[PDB]
Every structure is written in C-alpha cells, then in structure tokens.
Design a protein around this ligand. Structure first.
Ligand SMILES: *[C@@H]1O[C@H](CO[C@@H]2O[C@@H](C)[C@@H](O)[C@@H](O)[C@@H]2O)[C@@H](O[C@@H]2O[C@H](CO)[C@@H](O)[C@H](O)[C@H]2NC(C)=O)[C@H](O)[C@H]1NC(C)=O
Ligand SMILES: *[C@@H]1O[C@H](CO[C@@H]2O[C@@H](C)[C@@H](O)[C@@H](O)[C@@H]2O)[C@@H](O[C@@H]2O[C@H](CO)[C@@H](O)[C@H](O)[C@H]2NC(C)=O)[C@H](O)[C@H]1NC(C)=O
Ligand SMILES: *[C@@H]1O[C@H](CO)[C@@H](O[C@@H]2O[C@H](CO)[C@@H](O)[C@H](O)[C@H]2NC(C)=O)[C@H](O)[C@H]1NC(C)=O
Ligand SMILES: *[C@@H]1O[C@H](CO)[C@@H](O[C@@H]2O[C@H](CO)[C@@H](O)[C@H](O)[C@H]2NC(C)=O)[C@H](O)[C@H]1NC(C)=O
Ligand code: NAG
Ligand code: NAG
Ligand code: NAG
Ligand code: NAG
Lengths: 612, 612
C-alpha cells in the first residue's frame, strides 16, 4: 500500500491546504524544484529554538537556494496557530530584507492526522534517534510530589561540551546565578539561572565547585538558548555536561523548603521532523542537525542541486565500464574485481570515475558511524611498477549513504596498460561494511590540440609526520623521453590524525615539490582548522548533515567527498631535452614537524605524467 | 540504538507509571505471562467503539486468558482523563462479574511523547495500513464554507457490505431516516439518521432509490455503531458501501439552505494501536482487527500460549533432520530439497513435521494477501509407488508469517524406504512467494506394546466435486500381508471452491470409506459454514487476526493451520486372514453433488497402513 515510502523511491503526488491556498505536488518526467517537508512540534526545544533563534532565520533567508521550496506541517494539536506563528516569525525575520523566498515557503494548518496522504507514514517510519533529534526530556521527582515534572531540555553545543548525561538519577542544588564559585556540591547537579554573568563562566565555576553537571533554567517568559563559547572560552576544556531548560516554580519551591530533589534525563524517540524530495521526485533523507540552525537544511538543498547537475553529466555520451555494483567492502580484502577494458583506450583522452558508497540498507541508520579513507588500486601487469598503484581516493561520511561523486583521473590512464585489469577498493580493516558502486567513464575532450598520456612515473609516497619525515626522501633524477610535449605533476595528499598541535587532520601543512633545485611548487591546506572549511564543498559533492564533525576544515580533504587531485604543469620549468631533478618535502609553519605526542600521518601518492 | 525493535527480537526492559503504581517489565530466562500494549486515540472511531461497545468489553472479560497482561497508553493530549475513562468503562463492564482480570490490566496516564522508552519507536515504525486500521476520515466541503469539515467514520461490517468507497468526491442529499424509499438521488450519497427503523432497511431503501452510498449520522450525544445484519437480512446482498459517522450541524444547515455539499473519504495512516510481547519476551505483531471487538486480542493471546507449549515440545529429546531453512517457495517447482535420513529409522515409531511458513521480511506487511494450500511430497525410489506421494498438507494465512505448526504423520514412515530422499513443498503456481522451514522429528513412543509401520498402500485420490465425482471410484480389493497386527486408514481431505450451494470450501460434505461393503466409515465437516468454526482452533495452532475471512468454518481445514489427518482403526472390520474390499464415496446432504454453476474441488490423499 502507498507504493514505496523509503529513501530512493519516487514521491507520490499529493495535495495540501495552506494559508495561501492549495499546494499540489505531482511527479514530472523533467527536473524541477526540490522540496523540503518539515514537521514542527512544540514538545522539542530544538525546533522551538530553530524557529525563535534569529541566527537560524537569517541563515534560512540567506543560504537557502533559489530553486527550493519548503512546506511546514504541525503535528501538535495547535497546528492552526502554530502555522501562523511560524509565518509571522519568518516574515519578521525577512523584514527589511529579501521577500522572494517567501513565495517558496508554505504553511499547512491542517492536522497531521487529517492529511489523508502518505506523509504521516514517512514521518512515523523515518525515525531519527540521533544528534539533536529525539525529544530530550528532563524529569524532576521529589517524595513530596505525587508525580514527576517533565520539561524540555537543549544540550549545549556539540563542539563545546563532549560530556554526555547519564540515565542514572542525579540530585539538584540551588546555586543562584552560578557564576560565583561556592564551597561544594558533592556530585550534585547545579540549578543555575540564565543571565547576570557568562554561560561558560557559570559552567566553569560549577565544575570548580565539584559538580557533576549544570542545568540553566530560563527566566519566566524567556526562551531556551544554544550554549556555546566565544573565542578565549573555547580553548579551555570542560569535562562536565550541561543543558538549558525552562523555569519550574515547583523545583524552586522544593529547594526553598530544603526537600530533596532528584533529576533524570531521557530521550523519547520521536517522528521525523524533516524529509526531502529531490529535483527528480526521489525521496531523500536530510541527515542530522548538529545545532539548531536552518543552515543544515540549506546545505542539503545545495547537495540536491549538485546531484541533478551530476545526473546530467552521467547522461552525456561516454564509454562506461562497471567495476563494482554494490560490492561489499570490509576487512583487508575490501572489494576486489576484474574487468576487461575496451580494446583501444588511446582515443579516449579523458577518464573519470563515478563512485557511490552506500550502506547495506536504504536508510542512513544502517551506515558506519565513522569516517574512513577509501583507496582504489589498479593492477594490470604484475611485472610492471604500475601494479597496486593508487588511482583514486575518497572519504566516507558519518553515517550517510547518499554519496555519489565524479572524479577526473585522466592523467592516470597509462596505468591501464592491459585490456584486462584488476581493481581493489580498500578501506580501514576495522571499518564497518560499505557497499561500493564504481564506473569508469572514457570520453574524448573537445580540445582541438588533444594530448594523450603515455607514461606515468611514481615519485614519492607518504608516511608518518615526524621529524624524520623529510629525511627519508632523496632527490630523484629522471630523463625525459623523446616526443614529449607536456609534463605534469599529479599528487593526491591527505593529512590524518592529531598531535600536540592538532596536526595531520586539522593542520595548515605545506607540501613542496622542488624541481631542479631552482623553483618551488607549493600545495597548502589553508582551509584546514577552520570551523566551516568543509561546509563550502557541499555544492561540489560534499555530503552534508553528517552524524559527526563534517564542518571542520581538514587538511586536503573533506568528509563525504572525493580527494580532488593536485595537478600542476611544469613543462616550462623542466629542460625538455636533458635530465631533471625533483624532491618532495613537507613543512608545518615553515619548519619541519616536531610532534612530541601522538604524531600524525600523511598519505600521499605522487606521479609524473608525460604527454605525447 | 535501542537494539532490535522488529518482530522476533527481544523486548528491552522498561518502566511505566500507572494509576496503580510502577509497572516494570524485565526479560527473564524463563517463560512468564504474555503482554499486550495497546495505544488508544480519540481520533479513530474504531477504538472508540472498541472501548464503548458492550460486546467488546464482554468478549475481553470472557475470552481473555488468565495468563496474559494488558497495558494501555494514550497518544492523545488527554491521556490523564483517557486512562481514567478506560478504567471506568472496564470496571462498569466487569460489574456483577469476575474481577481478577482487573489485576492484569494497567492504564498509563503518561503521555506517549514523555515515556522515555522504546515503545513510541515501535508504535511509529509498526504502521498497520490495513483492515479497520488506519484512521478513516470523511471530509465535507461546500463552496460557502471557507474550509472543510473532517469527521470520523466506521465502515460497515466487512462480511455484510463488500463494496468499498472511492477516493473521488461524492454528493450529499438529506433523506431523513432513510427507511422509506424516495423518488431518486441520481448517484448522490444519502445522508440518513440512525434510529427509527432498521439499518439494513435503510441501506436497502437507499440502494433502491439509486444511491451510490449511504452515510448514517448518529444523533447528538450518541455513539457510532458497527453496521451488521441479523439473520434474514444477511441472505440479501447489497452492492453499495455504507459507513456511520457523528452528527454535524453545518452539513444539516447547508442541506436545509439547499446549497450543494460534497463528501470525500480518505484513510490517513496512523501509529500501531497494538503490539504484543510473547511469554518468552519476543516482540510479536497482533495482526488485524476485522471488526471492533476485543476478542481479536484474546485469540492472539491464546496463540502465544500455544506457541509456548509448542516450543516446549520441540525442546524434548528427538532426532531432528532439517529439510528446509527459509527455503523460498513460488511457482511450480516450489521448494525442492534432498536429505539423508538416519541409517535406521525402524526404532523410531513416531515421526512428526515441524513447519514454519514465513514471509521474505520480518513484518507481516511483506506477506501474501491470500490463502493457498501447501503440500509436501516425498520421493525416495522412482521405481516405487511411494514416489511423489503426499506426506503433509498446510494452509497459509492471510498476510501472516508467524505460522509454526507440528503435525503427526508417523503412519507415513514407510514412504521413506531409502536413506536418501527428496522433499518437494509446493503451493499454487500463481501464489506470492513464501519461505518454508521444515524439520522432521523422529522419536520413540512411551507405549509398551510398540507397533512399527511397514507398508502403506494408497487407496484413492481427490477430484472435482461434480455429479461424476463418485463414478470414477471403483472397489479396491486387497489381501493383507502376514505378520500383521493392526490396519489403519489415514486420509487427508480438504474441500475448496464455491458453487451454487457454496460447496467445497463452506460445505458440510460427508466422506464414506465403505469397507467389505458391510460397514461405514464417515468423516463429516460439521463446522463447515459456521461464522466462527475456525476461531476455536487458535489454541491448536490457528494463526489469528489474519487479513481475511479466517473465522468462517471451512470444510476439513482452517486458515493458517495444518490439516490434521483423519486416522481410523479397522482391524476389527477387516478379516485379518483373507481378502477385503474398500470403496470411497463423497456425498452432500446425503446425496451425490449436483453443482449447476462453478463446481467445487476435493483434494484427498488416502492410505492404508499396516503395522507389524
Ligand atoms: C622551496 O621552498 C623551500 C621551503 O621554503 C618554504 O617557502 C618559503 C617561501 C618560505 O615560506 C619558507 O619558510 C618555507 O619553508 C625553500 O627552502 C627553504 O627556504 C627558506 C626561506 O624561504 C629557508 O629558511 C629554509 O632553510 C629553506 N629550507 C628548508 C625549509 O628546508 C627552497 O629554497 C625553495 N626552492 C626554491 C626557491 O627554488
Ligand atoms: C455407507 O453409507 C452409505 C451412504 O449412506 C449415508 O449414511 C447414512 C447413514 C445416511 O445418512 C445416508 O443418507 C447417507 O448417504 C450407505 O449407502 C446409502 O444408504 C442410504 C440409506 O442410509 C441409501 O438411501 C442410499 O441409496 C445408499 N447409497 C448411496 C448414498 O450411494 C451404505 O449402505 C453404508 N454402508 C453400510 C451400512 O455398510
Ligand atoms: C512551545 O512550548 C513552550 C514551552 O511550553 C512555550 O513557551 C511558553 O511561551 C509562552 C508565551 O511566551 C509563555 O507565556 C510561557 O510561559 C512559556 N512556557 C510554557 C507555556 O511552559 C511556547 O510558547 C510554545 N510555542 C508555541 C508556538 O506554542
Ligand atoms: C472521542 O471522540 C468523540 C468525537 O469527538 C467524542 O464524542 C463526544 O462525546 C461527548 C460526551 O458524550 C459529547 O458531548 C460530544 O458531542 C461527542 N462528540 C464530539 C465532541 O464531537 C468522545 O467523547 C471522545 N472520547 C473521549 C474519551 O475523549
Ligand atoms: C573535589 O573533590 C576532590 C576529591 O579529591 C577534592 O580534593 C577537592 O578539594 C574538591 N574540590 C572542591 C570541593 O572544590
Ligand atoms: C607485462 O609486460 C611485459 C613487458 O615485457 C610483457 O612481456 C608481458 O606480457 C606483460 N604481461 C601481461 C600479462 O600483459
Ligand atoms: C435507476 O436508474 C436506472 C437506470 O437504468 C433506471 O432504470 C431506474 O428506474 C432507476 N431507479 C430508481 C430511480 O429508483
Ligand atoms: C528401488 O527399489 C528396487 C526394488 O527392486 C531396488 O532394486 C532399487 O535398488 C531401489 N532403488 C533405490 C535408488 O534405492
């Protein structure tokens, strides 16, 4: 019944009533605007802050694409008033700003249990149970009270306090504002009031007072806020959890009486608050929301656009060779396959890889909970140096299986020196299983002065980022073959791990390919270490709304995205008729690395390509 | 997260608050009382009638086992009052009756969105979308009204009106009581008021007035009722649908004004209203509810008991041989396998078959929507008559995959005359795929005077139930081998199809095995044709709450249950030293069948077994 209501299936047509009229969705054979259906409920402080926080509304008005529509439903019994409240909030935010986006926003006062469509089934069956998704509740219990008092809570920013609450009951002690250290609480959760001083200061003072946790209650008539640091506050690390709730007269009266009070934290599973329909009418999951900002939706929308632009590229003329079709990957072997390439790949001067790393199930919940590198090695002649050489590199997403990327690896065509070859896609041995689908697309460029690769010589590999990292690399002297018109450097470099300086994965590390000991060739990961360095690559293929730190700018790569190779032309630098020398070296802050604890890692694959 | 929350997985421990105290469920290594969790919502007239209809409460108080517990939650915002209302209704029903059952009923005033447990996830993810499950709603729309009016509706009894509503909009005409024929409505749904005359009379008069449907509105302050016939009314067949709703002043005022009024019918998907935990802590689906009566729960509970009693039997000492392990079945081939039986099965005088017919997925929604016969044939020597002979017969359930039966087929042991044999489980070729798991259990009986079968001779087969049915059967003359102490008749007979007399599947047909033309041997399907003939076999293995007419008493079989063979001893009738004659014949009402239209079918497999 109702057809397929799982990710990847088409979205059946439907009709809804809204303050502006009848909103009708009908599948089309063409590509149109993507849709985002959002279900709002007053029982979650996450959505309340989403719709009340000015930053979230500004992000929605600014970063939302111009080719996306949003529909809002209310699962609460006050849907009629809830829709009007949301519309008023949006209009007030858009005041003295753009107003075209309003035409793409629709608010349905209809009750969820009266739609008469397939939407409630999707909302119920697409349960999130993850980051900032799932009603977080706080239960206050006292012997005097005949029953508990249940309220909403919003956990602090994921990037500030990594400590998590425990299901075991806690105590509760009144500490007023909480920004002045007290004698001691003896492992009793603090009951503090927002305002007066800083939030970070409150948490720090409570931790210094021997407190297992803190609970900020908003003053009457106020709203919950997202707890986060500001500059100097973030360097300091706090090892206790915290959350913000509303004000309850009962707990205050009990504390004044001196009666014991206990507090418990729970996560009640809820219904999906977001689900998207792609530009082609395909149902898609919107991932997780790390913190209450509408930006997470916009990024998802951006991805949809890219996906469409991707699906148009694959439809173009090209010779397709399928290597993997949902082939399972896990362990050392990973995914091994053997293919028979066309008889003659010489005319094809362009080679691309279309890759899709999905999970065993359609839903994202059945995916790996970590990001692990993936490498594609190719072997066509064991008696040649090209065997087991890396052809492409990718990075998995945090519990997402919608990844679909296209990478240009044309200069590595000479590695395929045999009509029959073997391809091995490998990841971390201890990684959870994945399902890889890979296709090689051969094509001829539109360039008039077409050039064809004929030789690929590996230059240097990676290694541990230690003080001896640059001591293992020696100058390579090579002579250029005749009938050569162009020389290129093709290097795939990625830093991993953390050290005293958080280097490797979050390091601004420079890599130099000195040529003829006379000219530099620099690759720098400037975006590394930035809070949102990897958030700008979603239009380019990055998978957004991942269950992890997918926003941090990494060194040379990003989560849920292929590693775009670094290609440089050095035909001018080299002496086309004579010998040349090349030497690699990596540096940090302009000096060799000196990691005293937990040294990082550098995975590199470098090649020198000669064109006819 | 939350472990496995699908059918067949264990139920994690949990705690809930109720008017009587703290209800705690903790898995145990032993077997205890089964549990039934029911979610109630005021938005469904089905549950409202369930909790307001006296018949349903009486059925709950009478047929509910004494080893079952029921917990009730309310998904509505009035849970506190809803639980008290349910408790008051139950107590009033139990007045002047038994009160022990009350100790096994618990009512939780806690809101569903505040449980803090795994129950809401199951309720949301176990969507029903089927018979009398899924909010049936009626939408009244008029040009004068700025918005539609949505109300609850309860479709008439499934066994009375098979006509179904259409998603297309209808009209609405006021016809008062509706038990007096009018001029004509011209394909306009009738708007009638309950009371004054009979419901069947109202529907008949409306159909005679050229009406596409009828809608009964209950008087203000009244409640919806289940539409059904009474004796003479049921013989007559009506080809239009009908439903009962509440009274709306707006539609009445509009009709008085003469303004056009349109009515539409929809089915909004909802959350699961019932889910059960077996005696061993395994989550189990409760199937569908054909009409609003609590009996459907009780039957399910009964099944649980049987299941436990079944699982204890399998744990007993026995030689187990697995033939199928979730082997797929579909098409003509069905499921074919080859097994190597023990070296010597002579000492094992008892042979049983443990069978489980599940679906491709754990959920019942992925199951076949029809009941189809299943037969197990065995071949051990192509040069022997025993090849391709039937060993066991089963009947699938309407969209249920919890079937697990144990059938005694010991007299058919001689069919296994070779250590290696081939087993073929076959169903209707056009049937949806199933997954069969079969095990043969050999055991030695506790009887002191043990007897061992050594010869099985087929006697007669089935055929089409026509006037020539008995003309194709001739007397079989057989001589008994020496060293024989007992002779048995083992016949598996099943009627199928319908005819002018509804014979075959719903026929009281007698089968006679005349022996030596001197003594009868009668098998009669007395329960055939009864409304609840097959409802009494749930404790014996019948799968209850099927998506079909599983309550009707069939001829010699029942839905979701094995066909228990008919075994009779005739050692006295036969001349142990001499020849004997046997002749089969089937009769209806004491006479040969004379089906003028759509003749039925009789599937029979008969054997004469000789014991040492
Ligand atoms: C190739 O570059 C290296 C490294 O210099 C880096 O880039 C410079 C522009 C500057 O930012 C340095 O701090 C970087 O480390 C050159 O060798 C180094 O040159 C620097 C001065 O630029 C000197 O202090 C170091 O001792 C040199 N050696 C090292 C770092 O090992 C090199 O000269 C460049 N090649 C050329 C210009 O042909
Ligand atoms: C075996 O039974 C048949 C069938 O009789 C049936 O059972 C009877 C008790 C009675 O209910 C009949 O109406 C049933 O049909 C006997 O043969 C028939 O006997 C009936 C009278 O009982 C007679 O009218 C029929 O013509 C007979 N023949 C038929 C129905 O084909 C038969 O005699 C029985 N065998 C015995 C007693 O040894
Ligand atoms: C969402 O729920 C919160 C929490 O109940 C509501 O917050 C209330 O807001 C009103 C209006 O400012 C205050 O008077 C109350 O004191 C607040 N707390 C309560 C009622 O507990 C909030 O209004 C709700 N939002 C919507 C749109 O209904
Ligand atoms: C379930 O919903 C129905 C339909 O709304 C309620 O029926 C109402 O019952 C009251 C009390 O007898 C009447 O006064 C109303 O006229 C009825 N119809 C309405 C309100 O539309 C019924 O009470 C509800 N049950 C519970 C337990 O809340
Ligand atoms: C916290 O407890 C520790 C236990 O070792 C104690 O040394 C310390 O002084 C306490 N700090 C307070 C009460 O601020
Ligand atoms: C590998 O290359 C060598 C080069 O001498 C060639 O002789 C050999 O046949 C090649 N092997 C295959 C399997 O193509
Ligand atoms: C119903 O319509 C049919 C159309 O053939 C007509 O013959 C019949 O008289 C009508 N019956 C009524 C209006 O009762
Ligand atoms: C079948 O039975 C016959 C009886 O003569 C015997 O000769 C033959 O070997 C048997 N076949 C098998 C496969 O057991």
């Amino acid at each position: 019944a109702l057809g397929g209501l799982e990710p990847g299936d088409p979205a059946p047509a439907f009709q809804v009533h809204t303050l502006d009229g009848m909103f009708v969705y009908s599948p089309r054979n063409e590509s149109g605007r993507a849709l985002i259906v959002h279900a709002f409920t007053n029982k979650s402080a996450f959505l309340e802050c989403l719709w009340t926080w000015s930053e979230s509304l500004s992000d929605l008005l600014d970063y939302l694409p111009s080719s996306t529509e949003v529909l809002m439903l209310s699962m609460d019994e006050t849907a009629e008033q809830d829709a009007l409240w949301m519309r008023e909030q949006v209009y007030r935010a858009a005041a003295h700003r753009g107003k075209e986006i309003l035409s793409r926003l629709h608010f349905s006062p209809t009750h969820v249990y009266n739609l008469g469509n397939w939407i409630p089934r999707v909302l119920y069956s697409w349960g999130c149970g993850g980051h900032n998704c799932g009603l977080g509740q706080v239960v206050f219990s006292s012997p005097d009270w005949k029953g508990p008092v249940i309220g909403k809570r919003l956990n602090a920013r994921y990037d500030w306090l990594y400590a998590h609450w425990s299901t075991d009951p806690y105590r509760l002690l009144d500490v007023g504002d909480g920004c002045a250290p007290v004698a001691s609480l003896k492992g009793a959760v603090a009951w503090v009031s927002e305002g007066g001083c800083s939030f970070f200061t409150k948490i720090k003072n409570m931790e210094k007072s021997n407190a297992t946790g803190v609970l900020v209650y908003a003053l009457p008539g106020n709203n919950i806020q997202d707890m986060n640091c500001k500059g100097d506050e973030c360097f300091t690390s706090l090892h206790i959890p915290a959350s913000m709730v509303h004000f309850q007269p009962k707990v205050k009266e009990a504390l004044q009486k001196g009666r014991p009070v206990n507090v418990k934290f729970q996560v009640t599973p809820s219904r999906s608050f977001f689900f998207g329909i792609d530009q082609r009418g395909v149902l898609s999951e919107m991932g997780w929301f790390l913190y209450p900002s509408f930006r997470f939706m916009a990024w998802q929308a951006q991805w949809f656009v890219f996906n469409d632009a991707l699906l148009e590229q694959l439809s173009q003329p090209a010779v397709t060779v399928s290597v993997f079709d949902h082939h399972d990957m896990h362990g050392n072997a990973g995914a091994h396959a053997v293919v028979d390439l066309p008889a003659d790949i010489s005319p094809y001067d362009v080679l691309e890889l279309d890759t899709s790393l999905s999970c065993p199930g359609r839903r994202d919940e059945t995916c790996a909970h970590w990001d692990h590198t993936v490498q594609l090695f190719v072997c066509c002649n064991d008696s040649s140096p090209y065997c087991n050489q890396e052809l492409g590199r990718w990075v998995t997403a945090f519990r997402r299986g919608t990844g679909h990327w296209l990478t240009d690896v044309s200069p590595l065509i000479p590695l395929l020196n045999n009509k029959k070859c073997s391809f091995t896609m490998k990841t971390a041995p201890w990684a959870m299983p994945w399902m890889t689908t890979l296709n090689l697309r051969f094509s001829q460029s539109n360039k008039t002065e077409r050039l064809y690769p004929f030789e690929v010589m590996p230059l240097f590999n990676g290694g541990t980022f230690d003080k001896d990292y640059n001591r293992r690399y020696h100058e390579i002297t090579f002579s250029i073959p005749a009938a050569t018109k162009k020389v290129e450097l093709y290097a795939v470099i990625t830093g991993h791990g953390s050290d005293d300086n958080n280097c490797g994965e979050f390091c601004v590390t420079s890599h130099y390919f000195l040529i003829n000991r006379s000219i530099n060739n620099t690759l720098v990961f400037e975006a590394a270490g930035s809070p949102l360095g990897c958030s700008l690559l979603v239009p380019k293929g990055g998978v957004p709304n991942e269950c992890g730190t997918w926003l941090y700018g990494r060194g040379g790569w990003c989560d849920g995205l292929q590693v775009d190779p670094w290609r440089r032309d050095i035909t001018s630098q080299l002496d086309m008729s004579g010998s040349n020398s090349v030497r690699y070296f990596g540096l940090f802050e302009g000096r060799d690395p000196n990691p005293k604890t937990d040294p990082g890692n550098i995975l590199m694959y470098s090649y020198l390509v000669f064109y006819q």
